Amino acid sequence: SISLGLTAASVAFPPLIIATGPIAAIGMGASSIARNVARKEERHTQWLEYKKFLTDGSKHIVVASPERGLLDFSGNKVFGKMVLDLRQSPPLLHGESSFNADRKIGHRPDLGDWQIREKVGYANSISPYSSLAHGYANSKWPRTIPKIPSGEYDTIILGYGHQYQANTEIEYLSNWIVWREAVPDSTSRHKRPPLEVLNSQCTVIAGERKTTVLPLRVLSDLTPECTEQAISLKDYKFILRGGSGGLAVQVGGAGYYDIDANLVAKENTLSFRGLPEEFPLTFDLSKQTQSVMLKTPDDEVPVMTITQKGINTLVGTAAGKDRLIGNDKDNTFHTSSGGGTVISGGGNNRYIIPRDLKTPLTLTLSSNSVSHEIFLPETTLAELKPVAFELSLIYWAGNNINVQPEDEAKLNHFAGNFRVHTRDGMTLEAVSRENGIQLAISLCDVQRWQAVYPEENNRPDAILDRLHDMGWSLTPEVRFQGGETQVSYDPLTRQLVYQLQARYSEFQLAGSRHHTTAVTGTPGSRYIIMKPVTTQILPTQIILAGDNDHPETIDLLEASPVLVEGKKDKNSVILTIATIQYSLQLTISGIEESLPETTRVAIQPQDTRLLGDVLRILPDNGNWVGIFRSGHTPTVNRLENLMALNQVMTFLPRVSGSAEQVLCLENLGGVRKKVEGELLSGKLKGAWKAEGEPTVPVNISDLSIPPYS
């Protein structure tokens, strides 16, 4: 139950990169224990305080979690010159332990207590073992180098561990008649420091996989305590060597870093998210040696000195003004939310910029670069104002990115080399117009757009309509990404092509007055063309592919047609459909340059007519003859033949839309049929006799049918 309070729920798809390294406490070094010792007390009590500091500094040199693949060397305070080798299956840990010191014999770990006692000669050989200073001049508080369990490790937390020499003396306790290890008496001449520091270094050599190095964060805000702690540790030497998997360094906040990233690795991060959120950062990837200045009152202190090689994924601070300069190679810049400047050198450069920028961010485009992709993980397209003849990302509300080139004379360059992604997935592209360059849409991922705007209807026609609503210039060919089908549109010819390569795909099409609709059919594909909602709709074109094995089926039941007329020409049948008030027209074509003679169109549930049957009856000349006419009779809704005899238990399902069922009893025999019907559930209105005459009532007990009618 106590542990439950330290757990955190997972965050799904973080739109930006955050800091995940531990933050150092205040007073981690030997200054605090020095002040605790500064009070005038017994010497052996002072030494006991120092020894307790060493015991805690060595108690937790490493916490290993191979299940999650994490190693924590933040509790390392006394193990200096640490070297970690992740190349071996059990990682190799080497280093230097802190050790005691005698004014004359030095440190001698190989001896027992009696041997050192004889060497210095402070007690008699008859004195008990309890009278001697246990561990004098022969101890190492790390004791044995800890053994890391074999496992697969990808995150390494690095502490700031120094190796210490504990200069100690021998104190006589006459009243306790014992001999003890004590701190040297500084009043006696000038005695050696009670704790002297020797090494201020660390080293990690990464294996073959991707490794994340998170040094302890010491400059995590601008408070005087954190600032002074970081200024103390400003010369700590970090030596990082990455593998071919990739090395991601998240700098703690202070020290000397020497990063040697593998050039083969695809992505070598250098993240500064650990610094204070509002930190003025000025970094350059074309400089090997760089110092990260910190402005203290009246002075500058190089709180960092980074020497880097093989880095291509600079990550700026959280919300500070960052001046990032890139490299002549490919780069990826995770900018901060405080604005700044992101000069990007040659090669291919990608940029990830957040929303709500506290200051306009300026993107300078180098003349040597080739392509620039801008990702907006938190910005939707509706927040950008479509400015013509300008590539700058001008926001409707908020500070706007100011994309500029290095040279305006070659401003014409970069056309079609500037893709601005968006949280909804829609991708702008810098296409050169006749008298300038513009941002126009070419790619549009329907899945992410549906995710961000779920409530509104998601149909490609509605999508395009909405883009035309906002007044966004569009590319000569625009493609829709995702969905069961592929959609393309050409504004230059203003034509919509939709390909339903999915087999037996149930598809719904509504025409619009703003585009011509093109459909590519597949075997088994069914098009559910509903009642039109607008008039003056541009012509429709559907192409089938008949394989003579599994015929396509076309259903127009819910279209609610009134009059459908046909014509044929040039291996293509042009149909027109007139509803009660709307109208539409379509052309059926084929891929094999021949209209399939097996494809069936289901005009009514029991009226499925083969394309061949209509195909013969329609003349080769360009003349229209009706093929479906409601003006002959109401839309028959059921066609029951009379070969079935006796009890046949006819069930006719209810229907929400029509609210009127028409059952056609058809006789194929030459004998006048006389059926003794019976209503058990439902009501009848009578039998049709004429097209414009109301339903003639007739008794359901007697149903006489003429032959061949």
């Binding site: 087999r503 069930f651 559930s681």
Partner: protein, 128 residues
């Protein structure tokens, strides 16, 4: 109550991708936590056994129909509601009609097995 045993039940579902012969006899299947599984006792004219939707059409014939209560329906249609938490035993699946994307499955009564993942390897759940 009688026809709850003599009359077998029928179900139709759609699956995006089907693996040839991956189903074996004796496999345990389980319905998701739906309110009531709406099933149709007749498919000859109800138009549920007919091909509809994209992909493979998979058909179930429940020999054990008992345990389903009918709902408020217009007199003339047979529709029943099945309570979730039911064991299902898939048997007799053949793909001689592989190009027509038709799967035939035989079912019978089952007990309280409490196991059986219904999501196909491609991720499509059955009994929908």
């Amino acid at each position: 109550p009688e026809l709850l045993r003599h009359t077998p039940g029928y179900i139709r579902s759609t699956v995006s991708k089907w693996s040839r012969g991956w189903l074996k006899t004796g496999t345990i299947l389980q319905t998701p936590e739906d309110r009531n599984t709406d099933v149709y006792l007749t498919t000859i004219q109800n138009n549920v056994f007919s091909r509809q939707g994209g992909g493979y059409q998979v058909y179930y014939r429940i020999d054990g129909m008992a345990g389903a209560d009918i709902a408020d329906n217009a007199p003339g249609e047979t529709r029943c509601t099945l309570r979730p938490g039911t064991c299902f035993e898939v048997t007799s699946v053949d793909e001689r009609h592989y190009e027509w994307n038709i799967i035939y499955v035989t079912l019978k009564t089952c007990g309280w097995s409490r196991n059986g993942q219904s999501k196909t390897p491609n991720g499509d759940n059955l009994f929908n």
